[PDB]
Amino acid sequence: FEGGQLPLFRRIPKRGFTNINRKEFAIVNLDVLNRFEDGTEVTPELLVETGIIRNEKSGIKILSNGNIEKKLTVKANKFSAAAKEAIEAAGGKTEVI
């Protein structure tokens, strides 16, 4: 309340809408994949057991942030272009389940 001066929130317009079908992915940066042993097949189920992602909202997306050392086989619902390149640049294969 501003003692009758029109409050800030009414001086400015409402914006946008909420999407009923909004997908939010559980994010996994490369750095945490170094945790795993070399030549290992990283699944969502393996990513929740280990305790890296607890709730797999809409799916698991792999993002680049950090740098991967080990040569893995990572299967996730989505990969960033950079993440895919980086997983491969190390000497691994990405699959999109």
Binding site: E2, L8, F9, R10, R11, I12, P13, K14, R15
Partner: protein, 63 residues
């Protein structure tokens, strides 16, 4: 009981990564004959909530 979010505010502000509030500008419906194209370009962008205003309203939009 839980605090209630101010819904008017929740439809107008957006919380940034650093925890500030971003807002739109006012004078951006109608009466556009009365504003310059420079004014229009500027008013079209987003803005941050001022320190003074933020102090007054932050509890209204916690959560």
């Amino acid at each position: 009981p839980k605090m209630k979010t101010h819904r008017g505010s929740a439809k107008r502000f957006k919380r940034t990564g650093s925890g500030k509030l971003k807002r739109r500008h006012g004078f951006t419906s109608h009466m556009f004959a009365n504003k310059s194209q420079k004014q229009k370009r500027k008013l079209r962008k987003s803005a941050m909530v001022s320190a003074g205003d933020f102090k007054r309203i932050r509890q209204m939009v916690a959560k």
